[PDB]
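ligand=2-acetamido-2-deoxy-beta-D-glucopyranose
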Amino acid sequence: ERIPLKKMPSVREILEERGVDMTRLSPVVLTNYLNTQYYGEIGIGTPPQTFKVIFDTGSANLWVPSTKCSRLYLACGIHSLYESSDSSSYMENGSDFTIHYGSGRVKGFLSQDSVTVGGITVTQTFGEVTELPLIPFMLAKFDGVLGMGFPAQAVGGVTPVFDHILSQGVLKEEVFSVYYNRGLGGEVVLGGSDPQHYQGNFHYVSISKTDSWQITMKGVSVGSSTLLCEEGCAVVVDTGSSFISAPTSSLKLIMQAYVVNCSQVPTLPDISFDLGGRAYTLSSTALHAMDIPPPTGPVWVLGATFIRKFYTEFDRHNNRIGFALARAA
Ligand SMILES: *[C@@H]1O[C@H](CO)[C@@H](O)[C@H](O)[C@H]1NC(C)=O
């Protein structure tokens, strides 16, 4: 059940610790892994080769770096690498695959092997990567990504790891939840929600998009005066991102009540989100702007800053996302 997430210095923090100015730079790739601060561990093959990977609801693909990456792409060779020759359960596919990480592309080739997560082993097709772009993977500690999205938003319709876990019928519920710690680490839970890391009762919102973790938000109120999204804004609850995102035009109106107007005062107004008629509020605590074109545009993103306060259950059977007040012990 329990997969313990570990704390990580993001590529942003790695760059900001050095001291630097502003610099340059199929399904929709939502998250930039520049700001990601969390990873979990998974085992591939027989015997298991361990990999540090991001648990990302934004994507539906599982990829790790291969031993077969070229000398021309140096970002791949740094991380832990998958060798097919050390696995008895390896079964070759050979088909090309290409995820568009940002402007640049993450290229490789497909392959099948036994993938172990949270004690459960499943036969999974994954893309062993041969070309990672320079930004932002060279500085990043995490090896690859584990997609928690739907089969439709995967590449080549490859069934995700959670879908294979549902096929076995091992879990009590067909769900997974996420908890990020207030401070060292996190937690992904499979087949339920952990009562230690929540308080009160869950309340659920139905999924609006056909096959994604997207829900329609009905109000973004600053303090006690409403600004945006009364008619309806689409919102993705991403696990692999830390920041909260919004449309570029919408972000300006919220910032009013390169440039960020942050000064040391704790009496700034609380900001809340209306999800299924219930107000989900954040005291202080940052934002960003992502303008995606339609379809899947314009859209917001609720990252780890939201999920830190609210423990989030991702329900696949009922197609819904539940929220509840978080806590530690
Ligand atoms: C690779 O696996 C996929 C299943 O996701 C399948 O559709 C495809 O035919 C396989 N390709 C080869 C060359 O075996």
